[PDB]
Every structure is written in C-alpha cells, then in structure tokens.
Ligand binder design. Structure first.
Ligand SMILES: [Zn+2]
Ligand SMILES: [Zn+2]
Lengths: 332, 332
C-alpha cells in the first residue's frame, strides 16, 4: 500500500536506432492498436505491452485504484544494450534518462527515477551516473545482473561502485539477458527459473568478489526477493567454508557475514516465502516492489505484506515504505 | 541418524573406455597415492577423491562412526555418459550396475542400490531398468535432470516412466551436466547455483509436462532439497496462472496441485531452509540424504533434522528413515 521500488516504463516513441547508429540489433516500439504496442528486435515481435507501460496519466489512475503513492521508474531491461558500441549505448542512455526525468518533473510526488548506464564502458558509466545524480536528480540507477562476460565481482566495475559511494547513488540490480533458446525455450523457464538464478549469481558475485567489504557505503537492492539466495544461502555458505581454494581467493569472509549488507524487493508471491526472506535478509532490508505493469508482478500491491499475521504494524510499514525511503536516501 | 538416500560410489578400477569403445571423452580413475585417486577426462584431472569413494569397508567404518544404518548407493553423475553411442553407454551401465550389485550382496543390511540407465535411448533404458529390478534386486535408479536436449517432460521418455510404474522402480533425480565454463568458471558457481537451478528446471518440466498427472504411481525424489523450488514455487505457480499460453499447453493443472506428489532429499544445510522445505513439500515427503563422500554434503548426518525444535519425534523419524523406506518400497 505505499512505495513500489520495482516498476518499468518506456518512452512513448523513440528514433530508428539502426539508422541512428549504423547497425541492427536494437529494439523499437510499434503502436499497432489503441492502447496497445509491440516491442521488436529487427523485425520480430518479442513482446506485447499496454498503454500503462508509457502513459504516466494511465499509471497514476491505476496507482490510485491500488493505493500506491510512489513508483520508482526504471526502463525495461532489454533496453540496457550493454552489447553495443560504448558511445551509442551512452547516447541511448541519455535519451531514456532524460525521458524519465521529464516524467518525474510532471508528477514529482508520485514518481522518482532510476536511470540506466553504459556499464560496458566504466568511464562513460561514471559520467552518466554523475549526470543522473547532479543534473536529473535521480536517487539511484537500475543495472543488470552481469555485463557481457563481467559478473558484478569484476574489478573493471570498481570505479562505478566508487562513484556510487561518493554520489550516494543507490543501485537496483535486475536480472536480464538470460538464456532464451535451446532447453529454456519452453514453459516460460527464462522468467520462472533463469531470472532467479541470474540474481543469485549476482549476489554471490558481489559477496565473494569483496564488493560489500571494499565499498561498505554502497546501497544495493536485488530484484525478485534475492532469487534463490534466501533458501540456498546455507548451501552457498557451507560450500565456501569447504572449498576456500575455489571460493575465498577474492574475499575470505564467509557469505553469511554479509546478511544485513544489502536489500531485496519483496516480490516472492507466497507468504511462506516472504517470511523466510525477512528471517534471512532482515525486516529492515525488504522493500515492497511490484514489477508493474508486467503480468509476473503482484496484482494487488502490498497485499502479501498486509496479509502477514506474523508482522506487527511497524514492520508492515517498513516493508511498504520505510525501507524504500532508507535505500533511496529520501525524505520519509 | 538412520538412512541416507543420497551417496555416491565408484568401482575400484575399470577398463580403458577409449580403447573399449573406440573414441575419447570418457572418465577414468587413477590411483596416485595411498587412499587417494584422481578422476580424469582425456588427460586432465578434474577431481580428487578419497578411499571412501570406492572401499565399502572404509564406508562401513565411517557410517558406524556417524550412526548411519543404510546408504543408498548410486554412481558419480559424471559417469551417466548420456552423450555417447547408446550401446556403449549401456555396456558401461551394465558394468557399473553389476559392480554396485556385488557391493550390495557383500553388505546387504548396510546398502541398497540405485542403478544407472542409457537414458538417451529409451528402449535400452527400459531393458536395463528391467534387469536392475528383476535380476539385481535394486529398488530404484538415479537419473540426471536432463538428457542431452531432452528435459524430463520429453514424450520420448514416457516408456521409461511407464516401465517404472509397472516395475515399481523409484527414480532419484540428480542435477548434472551444468554449464562449467565462461561466467560459471569461478566461485564454484556450477555446484552452488547451477545444481539447484538444474533441479528446479527438472521439477517444473515433470509438472508442466504432465508426468505426475499421467504416471500417478511413479515415485520420484529430487536431490538437494528441490533446488530453488520450495522458495520459488509461488513465482512459478503465479506465472503459470498468468501465461497459460506459455505454461499450460501440455498440462493445464496449476503446479501447486502437485505438492505432495514427489519427494526431495533434506540436503539444505540450514534450519530455516529445512522448515520451509517440510512446510512446502510435506513432512511425509522429505528424506535424509547426505551426498557422502563429497565435501558439499552434510558432515554430521541427521544433525540438522535432530536439531529441529519444531518437529516431534515421529516427524524426525520419518525424515531420518520412514520416508526413505516409503519412497524405496522397502521393509521398515
Ligand atoms: Zn522487473
Ligand atoms: Zn550427489
């Protein structure tokens, strides 16, 4: 019933990116029908989306109906474009960040912005992060779980984490670029299994890569309840203890010592799962998020949290808003 | 403290498989040092193992020390060899199954056998299953989470499931053949993340492929606590409801209706994780298993279960032995 850390939005329209940059592989939005649009990647339709995916007015009406005060807006992850030339990804980043900032200016009490960065080129990413924070006024950014062959332990990314600490810029980590073909081409497995696995790999990578140890002021929240991590943390912690030759060469402290060091959203659908999440991650560390407007999201925002007889009213309030305001560094 | 459904053993020695079959890619055991051996795949050492991995006498002494009455013995999963020619995999299967049956005959009150099958060729697999059950006296078999490009929903495998129902042959499903290279080549991620993801994909595949619906007498137990499934079942069940076009074309019943239809081992390391597992899978459906003699296993077998103040003595007894005896169809 309060703040939603996890929601995705796109521009109304954007330019032909293939023409702008000189090579294909990019995505485009095609308005085929009233209140309806297609996303495509060279020719092929790969997703159908509704009006509420780009129209702030439509979003405000649906938020009102559901009792949601603020959405944190970030782009659709397929727009990350970490695969492209660094300056072209940055150019697209500036376009999506400015779009997002425009929307925020129009409804500054209903939205805040999480920008996107050219993470494959750390010098450009630092510079675009500095702009989002100093000029656009964003409290943080949304990044993917890996960047081409870099997982988030990668030393090449340390300048980005350092910039985040100095700028007080929060990081929302979202699974993306999962395997889509072969055995994963059935039963929606990329979204149902691939996403949570991507998130668990990101949490393990930042832990065992020493990111939380070296950048102790960095604020990070992972999407979809930490993936499998809240349930498989015992396996991970035990395995680290047993094979330090494999697990401890970048950071010798046991993963368990980092519980309390980062946030997750609360998007885990079931009450038994939400209770384990808070038991493991902490009542101060779980943030209502919805994945609005996508179907895999929570249909009645805040309902799972409010349905927990195990939680007092002060805990519910932390989960619904107070934790988001802490993670984002924003006034209650 | 009772029965261990999940333990791996190899023969003392076996022939040069490359010479036997006429092409490389197979594994071999090399005794380099006292009570020590190397596993290799063409030249390269990929694992070091101890005596207790092949010597039944050593295993009995370590079981006594730990209060373990019976181990269910199955081969090391890298021996599956589903990639090879069908008759060659079957020939190796017969050798490993006979080895296992010999060991069982020598200590028939301490061991039972779970055989291995040429799953890439279903007619041969049915025939070797019939032999393990009728001639070798095995109560079940261990199979992998996928078979080359077949996940376990594959219709080509239905004759194997049908044979299992008729023969009353239990199936222990073990994750294997994970990605090992690229981004997964660090931090032991194949074992810490890849294995649980493989298991969740296998549980989803058998559910949404209608395997439990079409073969309701089939007994199946998945390794490592069901992977992520006990925590991500809400995500999976919600997603199935939202996109039946993606999820329900082979079996329209919601995955949640199958909780209670299969078993898992109890190998989840942490007490919060063991409580969620029983809450989700059922107190009648969780089986003490250890992954003996591998380091990622439980070091004091049965200790997690016995440490649960939430469980009465009758529940502990089910988890330590009664559930295994039910899954295997064996006399208490
Ligand atoms: Zn999302
Ligand atoms: Zn095992």
């Amino acid at each position: 019933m309060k703040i939603d850390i996890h929601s995705h939005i796109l521009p109304k329209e954007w330019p032909d990116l293939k023409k702008r940059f000189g090579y294909g592989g990019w995505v485009q939005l095609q308005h085929h029908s009233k209140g309806e649009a297609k996303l495509l990647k060279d020719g092929k339709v790969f997703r159908v989306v509704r009006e509420n995916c780009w129209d702030p007015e439509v979003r405000i009406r649906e938020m009102d109906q559901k009792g949601v005060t603020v959405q944190a807006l970030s782009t659709v992850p397929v727009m990350f474009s970490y695969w492209a030339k660094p300056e072209d990804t940055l150019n697209l980043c500036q376009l999506l960040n400015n779009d997002l900032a425009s929307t925020v200016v129009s409804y500054p009490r209903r939205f805040v912005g999480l920008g996107t960065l050219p993470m494959q080129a750390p010098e450009l990413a630092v510079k675009e992060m500095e702009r989002c924070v100093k000029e656009l006024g964003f409290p943080g950014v949304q990044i993917g779980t890996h960047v081409n062959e870099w997982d988030l332990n990668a030393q090449e990314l340390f300048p980005v984490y350092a910039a985040a600490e100095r700028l007080k810029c929060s990081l929302f980590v979202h699974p993306w670029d999962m395997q889509m073909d072969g055995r994963m081409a059935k039963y929606w497995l990329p979204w149902l299994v691939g996403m949570p696995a991507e998130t668990t790999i990101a949490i393990c990578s930042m832990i065992m890569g020493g990111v939380f140890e070296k950048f102790p002021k960095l604020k990070v929240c992972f999407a979809h309840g930490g993936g499998a991590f809240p349930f498989t943390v015992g396996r991970i912690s035990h395995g680290f203890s047993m094979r330090p030759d494999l697990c401890a060469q970048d950071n010798p402290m046991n993963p368990k010592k980092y519980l309390g060091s980062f946030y997750t959203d609360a998007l885990v659908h079931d009450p038994l799962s939400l209770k384990l999440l808070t038991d493991v991650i902490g009542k101060d560390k779980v943030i209502l998020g919805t994945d609005y407007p996508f179907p895999l999201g929570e249909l009645e925002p805040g309902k799972l949290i409010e349905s927990m007889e195990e939680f007092d009213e002060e805990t519910k309030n932390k989960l619904k808003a107070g934790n988001a305001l802490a993670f984002l560094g924003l006034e209650r």
